[PDB]
Design a protein around this ligand. Structure first.
Ligand SMILES: [Cl-]
Length: 93
């Protein structure tokens, strides 16, 4: 697979509260820790250009101020994969 650095095409929120995403793959993401300690398990809302979805996630590693999320549902990671593959091709121009 592959990871993508966020160049601002990617916005995310948890329980309608926005979070900073800095890297993403079909199987997970690296996000920045905020004041509100985010749930160990939950639903992340992802927006990429005109595409919006929700992904079940869990926190699997906390590294300094970054949090590593794992997306737990295969069918949801399959959908995400295709969106990321589109976004990656767009950067290729
Ligand atoms: Cl909801």
């Amino acid at each position: 697979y592959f990871r993508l650095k966020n160049h601002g095409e990617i916005n995310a929120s948890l329980d309608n509260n926005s979070i900073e995403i800095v890297e993403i793959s079909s199987n997970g993401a690296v996000v920045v820790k905020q004041k509100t300690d985010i749930p160990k398990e939950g639903v992340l809302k992802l927006q990429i250009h005109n595409f919006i979805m929700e992904l079940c996630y869990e926190v699997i590693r906390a590294e300094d101020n970054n949090i590593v999320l794992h997306f737990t549902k295969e069918d949801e990671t399959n959908k995400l994969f295709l969106v990321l593959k589109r976004l990656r091709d767009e950067r290729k121009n």
